[PDB]
Amino acid sequence: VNSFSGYLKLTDNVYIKNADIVEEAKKVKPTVVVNAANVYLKHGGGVAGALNKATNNAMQVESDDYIATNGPLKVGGSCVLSGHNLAKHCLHVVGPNVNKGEDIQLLKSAYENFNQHEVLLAPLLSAGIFGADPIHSLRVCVDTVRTNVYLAVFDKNLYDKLVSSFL
């Protein structure tokens, strides 16, 4: 039993809700919140810009030190950093950005990072400003993640389409 509330159950392990991931994180304080990161951990917009803003830029400060030490992530890769005031940990996951020409096949590799964590609050990877089809992202999530994932979908219209079209 966990503290996530109001989710529709899609499969044994995947759940979905129309919610703002920032407000959802502030309420649940999950062990892991997933960020829709880029390889430079530059949290300018989309989910990343919103999560970072909610931390009063502390996420960005921590991220800049991480990059200065370790260099950029790989597309499809991840790193674990602090969750600041939102969660215990933030798993920064880089899905392919279609608006940069990146291989959509890397979306499965990106979701594989979720399997290192028993429970996560997450957005749909590569959706939104990353340019991929969210219906496809949900399919890859369900077919790749085996741990318990609670997906927050900000746009109510998109949420209804994802549910109604789910196989």
Ligand SMILES: Fc1cccc(CSc2ncnc3[nH]cnc23)c1
């Ligand atoms: F549109 C809104 C309305 C309320 C709050 C936010 C910030 S969080 C966010 N931003 C972008 N994509 C997302 N997918 C899941 N959560 C998010 C955005």
